[PDB]
Amino acid sequence: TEFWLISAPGTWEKLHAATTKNNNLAVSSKFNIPDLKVGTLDVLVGLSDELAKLDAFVEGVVKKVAQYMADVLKVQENLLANGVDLVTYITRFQWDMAKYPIKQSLKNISEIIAKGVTQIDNDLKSRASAYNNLKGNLQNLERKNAGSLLTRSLAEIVKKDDFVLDSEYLVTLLVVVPKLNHNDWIKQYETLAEMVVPRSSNVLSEDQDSYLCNVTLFRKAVDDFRHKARENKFIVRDFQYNEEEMKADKEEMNRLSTDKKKQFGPLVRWLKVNFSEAFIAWIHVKALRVFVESVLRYGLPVNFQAMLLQPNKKTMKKLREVLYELYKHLDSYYPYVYYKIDCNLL
Amino acid sequence: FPELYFNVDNGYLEGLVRGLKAGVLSQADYLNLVQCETLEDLKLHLQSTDYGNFLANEASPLTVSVIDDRLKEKMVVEFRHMRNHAYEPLASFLDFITYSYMIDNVILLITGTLHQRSIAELVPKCHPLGSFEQMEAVNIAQTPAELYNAILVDTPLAAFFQDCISEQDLDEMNIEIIRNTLYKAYLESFYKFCTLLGGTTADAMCPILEFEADRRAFIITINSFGTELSKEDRAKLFPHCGRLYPEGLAQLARADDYEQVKNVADYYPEYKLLFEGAGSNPGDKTLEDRFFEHEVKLNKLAFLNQFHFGVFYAFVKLKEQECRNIVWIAECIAQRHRAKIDNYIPIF
Amino acid sequence: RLGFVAGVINRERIPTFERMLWRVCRGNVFLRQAEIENPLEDPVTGDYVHKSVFIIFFQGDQLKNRVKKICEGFRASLYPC
Amino acid sequence: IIETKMLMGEVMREAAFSLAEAKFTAGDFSTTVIQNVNKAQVKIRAKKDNVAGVTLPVFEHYHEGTDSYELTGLARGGEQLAKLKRNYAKAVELLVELA
Amino acid sequence: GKLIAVIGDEDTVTGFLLGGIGELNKNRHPNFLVVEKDTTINEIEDTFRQFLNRDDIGIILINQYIAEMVRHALDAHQRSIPAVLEIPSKEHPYDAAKDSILR
């Protein structure tokens, strides 16, 4: 969705309804903004460099939070205080308590919108990135439980009868042998090193390509056997009592699944109210950009005639050409006030 | 039609360089290297390969700067053996591989000249493949790069110096603009030489030389953001060789942003899915670690053809990855930082 | 209060300068041109141009910063008035 | 002092490993970097600070920034460099506060 | 002083020259020295005198593996400027500095 907002001052407010007579172009809504504080000539044109930067900086913040909508579960449900973007564009007005008109419009009204948008930009970059870390560790949850017997954790293949306790003179090592060299390892598991148990070869779990077995040995002959296991294409992985901490990591797979869900409703309630505040902040900054450059392009007896427009699709070449003739006799880019906004979020 | 010939002159050497493919380390050879805990034990696990008894004479304190220098002196004596037995359709091709190292040594030989040095940088500080032990007038040319540039035209890099006048390298151009303008003229002359040799060596090699012109189209325009070289200065650094030539190089010379080089790689579906390095994550592969997985994917595909010259260039660029992988295993072992020890490229 | 600045510019861009200077300051200026006679010459900047007088008042005292970049962009030379 | 001798024990471990990442990508640049030195970028000025009337010479670093290694690599590397430059300029900012 | 000098190593100085500490004025000297395996201890002592008696050298960095070769030389330096810092290297982190002996 696109949008175009153009003011055309000098009755004069009845010629804005004549643009609604061209039914193929726009509906030409009013979208009145209240009277603001004037009284500056140097600071009026000096604010035009700051208001252009504020309109572009606040546009990228709300467009970066709309990209985060795909991570919570394309979706267009971002209402602005129980109101759609099209329903707010036909009923747009000043808040007068969040953007006060008693204060100065150039400096003070913009700084209250600037400091509010900068805090919401800070709270969206600092808080939402922390929830990506618990989801980044959740990417490593299935990564520890994927692949063959070597790449997978042993949280589900554990058994108390598969290892030798009282390890003062014994040690149980989880060895992996391929399916093609299983018979070659069965005749060589006892002859890999000295003082090896020749009958403890028990395949606990097997895969499609290899088979994981247990091999008991002494405490001193664990290193020379594993060095000979690399020559005999046998994969020996270390084992310890951290499976009870991997059972705590089996609960941490459910704790991070709980930490994702407990932070889902908290962040979706945060993105629903902050993006609606920032989209109304860019809407207030566009009207500040529309209140500016209208008292300089047109005369300032008291105040210029306020007017706005509505969106259009595929007839903008005919809409700009039909407005080119009515605006070329006004003056001596476009010949009048024009600000191209993007009604779409993505 | 190139198959019933090509065993006349190049039949013994092709079977030799495919015998050196069987010595390139497999995945199971790497999985025994990552279990090593000291560089003294890496000397043991490398002896079960074909590398064996190559570090048996150095020292008992085994540092990583000896393993790196002894690995790459084994690739030189395997390349120099296949060049000294080469015949002229293949010896002209094997000299085109050494021009990527003659370019990296000529530039090293003019920095000492601009800073008034001599042959003391020549012997210890140059790559042995592109080496100047003949053309002995280079070895005594102490002249400040004007009577020395008249000696570099007595060198096989003479045909590439037709875009670098001797006044340009005399402090007029940056030392990397002299590199990549020679490397632009090197790839475009090596692509034409690999097109004259037609048949199997023009369809198993020009896909490799197209990606090499698109690596240096993407990596140059990404590293040219903060520096002071204009868009017309990097448009003459793009080699006119790759897939990106009439259209991507028109957009890459106007980029000014990393997001403007990401949506010009989206037009080419081989280069998107390679632009998913995405270094905002703490631990993952970057862009050039994903361009190295594609450099060796095209290099393994050259061994699926048989009667062609591309089996020799795809061995030098896969024995160079051996000197980058085993040193990376050795540099994560000597520092005991082996959590990123799996960030190598598993070639075979 | 303030708002007077005096300079000179060539006649080959005097119509192109006043068209661009109005769009940059968003109006609020009074630029009255004044043509000249047989051409003068400067050493480095302007060679053999029949120039013209130029003054941009604009009454701003911060639009001078909007008139300092536009004066050197069209190669206009100002003087203390 | 002793707290920042164990702080530079891990900063110099990360910075020396970042050089190991940069030689993995871009060849060997240990002859281009050593040869191309003309002017320095990070200098120091001696400040004075006093406790109980006895002045102590202290150092404060500053950057007169023109990069002599702005183009280094640029076709191979360049992303492992300029994060090696950050991991050693951070070490110089620490080692001047130790000095 | 105003410069930072490094004796270091072959891999140490090429990391610090990328930091931006090296300056070349060929009238006097360069402000570093790459120490290889085939430099004598007599060459390390000579450049260590050059960095102490120079005016703009304010901080001296040196690896502790190299500093034990000239351990008799830097203990003779008992002045306030320049600061001789001892930095780790490959497989030679830190045992005891000359500054922590002064306690």
Side-chain angles (χ1 to χ4, degrees), chain A residues 8-10 17-18 26 34 39 46 52 56 60 66 70 81 83 98 101 114 116 128 130 136 146-147 155 178 193 198 221 229 248 265-266 278 281 287 299 301 306 311 335, chain B, chain C residues 3 6-7 15 27 34 39 43 46 60 73 76 80-81, chain D, chain E:
Chain B
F1 311 113
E3 41 176 18
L4 80 176
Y5 308 108
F6 173 82
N7 283 264
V8 175
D9 284 339
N10 317 118
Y12 160 75
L13 282 174
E14 179 206 356
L16 211 74
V17 76
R18 284 174 178 263
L20 311 177
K21 181 179 74 70
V24 179
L25 298 198
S26 53
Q27 185 84 271
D29 276 316
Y30 281 137
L31 291 184
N32 299 342
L33 287 182
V34 303
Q35 308 304 316
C36 276
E37 51 265 59
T38 326
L39 298 198
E40 193 63 43
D41 306 278
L42 205 78
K43 198 168 87 75
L44 272 71
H45 288 69
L46 275 178
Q47 281 183 7
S48 89
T49 80
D50 57 310
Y51 279 118
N53 304 137
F54 80 118
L55 280 169
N57 316 66
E58 304 276 354
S60 278
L62 200 56
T63 173
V64 79
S65 159
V66 172
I67 302 182
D68 164 55
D69 281 28
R70 189 60 258 172
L71 271 171
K72 81 183 299 308
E73 283 169 23
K74 197 179 163 288
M75 190 263 288
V76 165
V77 307
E78 283 171 324
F79 185 82
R80 285 185 178 173
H81 174 80
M82 301 182 315
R83 194 176 49 207
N84 294 338
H85 287 185
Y87 284 133
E88 196 59 40
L90 196 142
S92 315
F93 180 80
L94 281 198
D95 290 2
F96 258 101
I97 308 182
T98 81
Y99 296 154
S100 166
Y101 310 113
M102 283 186 181
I103 277 166
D104 292 329
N105 291 1
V106 154
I107 299 299
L108 192 145
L109 255 64
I110 76 177
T111 59
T113 294
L114 294 187
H115 305 323
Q116 278 86 11
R117 291 186 178 96
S118 43
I119 207 177
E121 72 206 337
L122 178 143
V123 179
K125 306 300 175 188
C126 293
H127 203 282
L129 287 192
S131 44
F132 307 109
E133 74 280 1
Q134 63 271 330
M135 62 282 293
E136 51 269 359
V138 183
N139 297 74
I140 67 154
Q142 301 209 347
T143 76
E146 177 52 53
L147 309 96
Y148 163 69
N149 186 86
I151 293 163
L152 279 182
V153 304
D154 311 336
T155 287
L157 296 199
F160 308 136
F161 263 111
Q162 305 316 105
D163 54 358
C164 281
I165 297 303
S166 167
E167 296 292 327
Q168 320 205 42
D169 63 325
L170 268 190
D171 305 62
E172 200 167 25
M173 270 169 43
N174 204 320
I175 210 65
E176 299 279 331
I177 313 295
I178 313 153
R179 286 180 92 104
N180 308 303
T181 48
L182 289 179
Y183 211 91
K184 173 184 173 177
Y186 158 71
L187 276 171
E188 295 173 6
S189 199
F190 185 42
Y191 186 80
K192 290 189 180 306
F193 179 78
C194 280
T195 317
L196 300 190
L197 310 172
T200 315
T201 177
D203 71 274
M205 162 66 54
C206 300
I208 308 179
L209 300 177
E210 270 166 17
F211 181 54
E212 194 58 43
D214 303 349
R215 270 173 59 175
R216 314 187 101 85
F218 279 138
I219 300 305
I220 285 178
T221 193
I222 279 177
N223 299 320
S224 159
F225 282 155
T227 176
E228 284 82 71
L229 57 94
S230 160
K231 298 171 166 297
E232 49 90 11
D233 214 338
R234 81 194 193 204
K236 40 187 53 62
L237 260 58
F238 290 158
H240 294 326
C241 180
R243 193 178 290 144
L244 289 151
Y245 157 70
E247 284 308 319
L249 305 189
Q251 288 188 74
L252 282 182
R254 310 181 322 212
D256 266 357
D257 189 12
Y258 179 80
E259 212 63 31
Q260 302 212 26
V261 307
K262 198 176 187 312
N263 45 61
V264 72
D266 283 358
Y267 287 122
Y268 302 93
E270 272 266 11
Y271 295 144
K272 83 171 177 50
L273 167 63
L274 259 62
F275 261 78
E276 266 75 2
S280 198
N281 48 46
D284 254 6
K285 284 159 179 300
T286 173
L287 180 61
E288 203 145 19
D289 290 357
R290 215 156 281 276
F291 274 0
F292 280 165
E293 300 186 345
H294 197 49
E295 167 208 331
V296 310
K297 193 161 81 57
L298 306 184
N299 277 316
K300 288 191 290 183
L301 261 55
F303 291 89
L304 294 203
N305 294 98
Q306 182 168 357
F307 303 99
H308 68 122
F309 286 154
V311 59
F312 294 92
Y313 172 84
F315 161 70
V316 186
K317 304 304 164 172
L318 297 191
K319 215 74 172 192
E320 268 199 351
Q321 201 73 222
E322 283 313 293
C323 313
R324 291 190 217 154
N325 282 347
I326 307 172
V327 173
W328 173 258
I329 303 302
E331 259 166 25
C332 285
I333 278 168
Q335 302 185 182
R336 289 168 199 88
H337 209 84
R338 40 191 197 172
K340 274 78 57 164
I341 200 168
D342 293 328
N343 282 27
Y344 57 88
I345 291 95
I347 170 64
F348 271 125
Chain C
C81 76
Chain D
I1 285 280
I2 300 299
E3 193 270 331
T4 66
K5 300 304 284 188
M6 310 315 147
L7 202 145
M8 59 90 75
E10 57 88 14
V11 163
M12 217 63 55
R13 190 194 285 110
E14 166 205 24
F17 182 76
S18 160
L19 171 73
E21 287 181 353
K23 283 193 302 189
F24 177 75
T25 290
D28 194 13
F29 46 84
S30 315
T31 318
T32 298
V33 162
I34 293 186
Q35 276 180 352
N36 290 353
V37 278
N38 60 68
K39 303 296 292 182
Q41 187 174 351
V42 174
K43 285 198 175 174
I44 46 174
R45 46 163 60 96
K47 300 286 194 186
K48 294 183 282 142
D49 204 88
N50 50 1
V51 50
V54 174
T55 192
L56 318 177
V58 292
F59 284 135
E60 184 254 0
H61 80 277
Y62 69 103
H63 317 84
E64 38 178 1
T66 184
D67 219 332
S68 192
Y69 305 117
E70 219 167 69
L71 314 175
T72 296
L74 177 86
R76 193 163 278 192
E79 309 90 48
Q80 269 63 239
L81 305 180
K83 82 172 277 294
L84 176 57
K85 306 194 197 73
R86 289 167 191 170
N87 288 330
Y88 265 110
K90 196 174 57 53
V92 167
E93 286 170 14
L94 161 73
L95 265 291
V96 69
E97 279 146 39
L98 172 63
Chain E
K2 275 186 61 179
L3 276 183
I4 306 182
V6 56
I7 298 181
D9 211 2
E10 194 264 310
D11 305 68
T12 300
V13 310
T14 177
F16 276 105
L17 290 191
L18 276 155
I21 73 167
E23 202 186 27
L24 182 57
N25 178 259
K26 186 42 62 183
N27 313 326
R28 308 159 295 170
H29 282 92
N31 78 286
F32 60 95
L33 184 78
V34 193
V35 43
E36 66 199 13
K37 306 175 298 179
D38 313 278
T39 62
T40 175
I41 298 145
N42 215 317
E43 283 200 47
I44 315 176
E45 296 161 39
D46 183 87
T47 176
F48 187 66
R49 299 167 195 276
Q50 295 291 330
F51 294 150
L52 291 179
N53 283 107
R54 259 172 72 178
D55 48 299
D56 44 356
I57 298 302
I59 302 169
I60 293 174
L61 295 144
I62 186 175
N63 278 121
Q64 204 161 341
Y65 181 71
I66 303 290
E68 298 147 318
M69 315 181 177
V70 286
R71 176 54 51 106
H72 72 90
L74 91 170
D75 281 309
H77 169 79
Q78 275 276 356
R79 298 183 168 175
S80 186
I81 275 170
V84 188
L85 289 165
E86 269 155 315
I87 53 177
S89 66
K90 287 199 163 294
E91 205 261 332
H92 297 90
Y94 187 80
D95 53 77
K98 60 94 173 183
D99 188 72
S100 278
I101 285 175
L102 192 44
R103 186 194 54 150

